[PDB]
Amino acid sequence: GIGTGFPFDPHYVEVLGERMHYVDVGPRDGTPVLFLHGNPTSSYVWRNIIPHVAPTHRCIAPDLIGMGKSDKPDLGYFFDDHVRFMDAFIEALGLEEVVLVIHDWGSALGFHWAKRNPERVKGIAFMEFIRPIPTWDEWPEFARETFQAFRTTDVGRKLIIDQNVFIEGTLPMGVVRPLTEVEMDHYREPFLNPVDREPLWRFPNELPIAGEPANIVALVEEYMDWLHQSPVPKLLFWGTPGVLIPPAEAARLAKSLPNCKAVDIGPGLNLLQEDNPDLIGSEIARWLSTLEI
Numbered sequence: 001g002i003g004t005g006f007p008f009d010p011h012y013v014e015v016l017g018e019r020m021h022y023v024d025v026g027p028r029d030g031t032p033v034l035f036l037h038g039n040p041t042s043s044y045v046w047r048n049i050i051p052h053v054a055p056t057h058r059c060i061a062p063d064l065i066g067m068g069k070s071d072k073p074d075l076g077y078f079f080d081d082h083v084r085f086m087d088a089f090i091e092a093l094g095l096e097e098v099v100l101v102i103h104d105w106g107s108a109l110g111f112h113w114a115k116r117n118p119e120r121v122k123g124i125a126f127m128e129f130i131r132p133i134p135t136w137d138e139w140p141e142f143a144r145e146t147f148q149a150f151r152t153t154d155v156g157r158k159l160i161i162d163q164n165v166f167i168e169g170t171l172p173m174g175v176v177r178p179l180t181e182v183e184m185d186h187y188r189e190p191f192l193n194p195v196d197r198e199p200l201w202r203f204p205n206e207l208p209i210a211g212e213p214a215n216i217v218a219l220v221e222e223y224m225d226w227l228h229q230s231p232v233p234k235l236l237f238w239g240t241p242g243v244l245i246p247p248a249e250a251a252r253l254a255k256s257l258p259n260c261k262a263v264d265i266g267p268g269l270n271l272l273q274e275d276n277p278d279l280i281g282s283e284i285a286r287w288l289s290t291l292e293i
Ligand SMILES: CN(C)c1ccc2c(-c3cc(C(=O)NCCOCCOCCCCNS(=O)(=O)C(F)(F)F)ccc3C(=O)O)c3ccc(=[N+](C)C)cc-3oc2c1
Pocket: 038, 039, 040, 104, 105, 142, 143, 146, 147, 163, 164, 165, 166, 168, 169, 170, 171, 172, 173, 174, 203, 204, 205, 207, 243, 244, 270
């Protein structure tokens, strides 16, 4: 079955006075492959995809500041915090040229970074990424009312911060197949203390839906406009029915994004990695071998 363990030796690096944990496996030489997770996960969401790439390429999977095994300072955990921390992390590791493998809010970080440093990105494999959703009618019907309540400071915080609803409910509801008690416990681990759950609430409140918030909408429209023109090699993973990328959206992205290969992973919601890790990791390795890296 799908692996439930996290057998990776811990690595840490001082970043802006804060310690950040990351996975680092694979051959020391060659172009590194940087794995970026999102809400509400960690490098744990990559545990079954990294082993397909580690035999031949260096694999770096950090835990975003405030999540996973990284330090958890008292911050708002706005997207701009994660941008400052991820920019410094990359420079603290001395990474020159990289290939990106990104998902959810890690895709926002990855796309925003690649647009500012397109000389250092040899390829992007992305899935269930962040794009400007123009209307709430584009969000799945089964999750509208809840995510609307999430984007308030009274009901949203009570649900997500006090009652841990994003871990206990929203995370299972983003995977088609059922998560095991071991897997739930891994995702629960960085957030047993309710105060440490700020990022779980700030991320859905940063989601560019229906024109708000205007600044995130503007930033994401910028890297979407770069994506539509840049020749950078592109690998899109999508599934049915999806959440952020519905199948109809993926088909247009496959026809409009230059240098783009799309791959139907089957049934899927948001955490595609948990529904078909074997196809995603095996397809990333195959695609990697076609890059000038
Ligand atoms: C185990 N088991 C299947 C469930 C299922 C549901 C629940 C629910 C539950 C959850 C929801 C709920 O989460 N709805 C919304 C689902 O969301 C699907 C969309 O995917 C988002 C993927 C993430 C995308 N990333 S991101 O955020 O950066 C973004 F989007 F990009 F910005 C709604 C109602 C209920 C309910 O019981 O009325 C619980 C509610 C309360 C609770 N108590 C107070 C402890 C425990 C709950 O326990 C549950 C357990």
